[PDB]
Amino acid sequence: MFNALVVDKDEESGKTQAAVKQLSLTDLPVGEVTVAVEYSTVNYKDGLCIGPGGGLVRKYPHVPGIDFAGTVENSSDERYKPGDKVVLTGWRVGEAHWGGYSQKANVRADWLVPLPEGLDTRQAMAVGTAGFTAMLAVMALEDHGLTPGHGPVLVTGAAGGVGSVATAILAHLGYEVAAVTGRPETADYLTSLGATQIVARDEINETVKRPLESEIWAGCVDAVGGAMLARVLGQMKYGASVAAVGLAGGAGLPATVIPFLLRGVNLLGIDSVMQPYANRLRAWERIARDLPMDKLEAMIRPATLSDLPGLGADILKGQVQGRVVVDVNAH
């Protein structure tokens, strides 16, 4: 038997409760590949799935965890064999299927990628869906012409996961990064990741009447969404793009079309969950080359399975800095 975080739901009271429980291999959903999980992480979406559900969890009891990395234990698919090091992010794992908050997980072979060279399984989860998506966002901006030397690139919710990794990647690629944070005490941390400007949240997180403000930003990786995204759109330089990643400041987008029509601004939707295998490989290879591992290390907050209920609540309140690494085998 082995340990896993299991969320139960009482339909009478609606109450969800997460707790570490002991499971057997026959408790997992049937799957092509059984992975001995070494690490997982805590993404914003994991906080939803650990706690209230956010409408993302269709079946209880539920083992959350949209990410894991580990070593293949058994496989009926010729792409993977015992001993292979593999990485899972997304594919609705941790939402519609039991996930990485477990010492063992069963998955479709289509859902895995090989552990990218340059990362161990710990670092792969230090990156996580959050860091993987920051890379996708940077790639989207590059695809639309972003190059260094043309003004600051805005990173919103910068003290969090997506924001920390995007800051580190963009700084390493030679960009001037303006980091937006509601936690001013993280400035030194953000500067150590490579940020060149620190922007207070309350300077940019409300809409204004004017549909256009001055052109400031050469591009943006947005983990916040909401009214902040609406405001940022009116501050983009001509032809610049926003990579839309997050909704931590709200799902509503109270925008105007004026920045798009008058300045050729783009709003580029970034979905990590259903990325094709080939682009997953591409983004992970970019991560191994362009995310300095010493910068990644500075983001890591260690945790165990027993820490997940509290960390899930913390991340939804915006109180997790950097990137949690869950050692599902600790002790």
How buried is residue 156: exposed, middle or buried, by Cβ count under 10 Å (0-12/13-18/19+)?
A: buried
The minimum distance between CB 224 and ligand NAP, in angstroms, equals: 4
Name the 3-class secondary structure at 228: helix
Shortest distance in whole angstroms from residue 43 CB to a second copy:
13
Q: Which residue is nearest to ligand NAP (CB)?
A: 160
When binding is defined by CB under 8 A, the residue of 192, 211, 282, 314 that contacts a second copy is 211
Q: Which is nearer to a second copy, 58 or 81 (CB)?
A: 58
At CB < 8 A and 24+ separation, what contacts does 206-214 make?
A: 206/231, 207/231, 207/254, 208/234, 210/234, 211/256, 211/258, 211/259, 212/258, 212/259, 212/262, 212/263
Residue 69 · residue 38 · CB < 8 Å: yes
Q: Residue from 50, 112, 221, 315 that binds ligand NAP (CB under 6 A)?
A: 315
Cβ proximity to a second copy, 2 vs 260, nearer residue: 260
- Per rule CB under 8 A, is residue 225 in the interface with a second copy? yes
Residue 159 interface partner, choices a second copy, ligand NAP, none, CB cut-off 5-8 Å depending on type: ligand NAP
Q: Which two tokens stand for residue 136?
A: 């996708």
Assess contact for 35 and 72: CB atoms under 8 A. yes
Helix spans in 106-209 (H): 121-143, 161-172, 187-193
- Contacts (CB under 8 A) with a second copy, residues 233-272: 238, 244-247, 251-271
Fill in the DSSP letter of residue 229.
H
Residue for token digits 């959903």?
Answer: 29
Q: Is 194 annotated as belonging to a binding site? A: no
Write the interaction track for ligand NAP spanning residues 98-137; mark x where CB under 6 A is met and - where it is not: -------------------------------xx--x----
**Chain length of the chain:** 331
Q: How far is the CB of 260 from ligand NAP (least distance, A)?
A: 8
Q: To the nearest whole angstrom, how small is the minimum distance from the Cβ of residue 3 to a second copy?
A: 32
Q: How many CA atoms lie within 13 A of 159 on its CB side?
A: 20
Which residues, 273 to 312, sit near a second copy by CB under 8 A? 273-274
Q: How far is the CB of 76 from a second copy (least distance, A)?
A: 29
Question: What is the β-pairing status of strands 2-9 and 16-23?
Answer: antiparallel
Host H or E run for residue 260: helix 258-263
Catalog residues that contact ligand NAP under the rule CB under 6 A.
43-45, 129-130, 133, 157-163, 181-183, 201, 205, 223-224, 228, 245-249, 261, 270-273, 315, 318, 320
Binding site for a second copy (CB under 8 A): 211, 225-226, 229, 238, 244-247, 251-271, 273-274
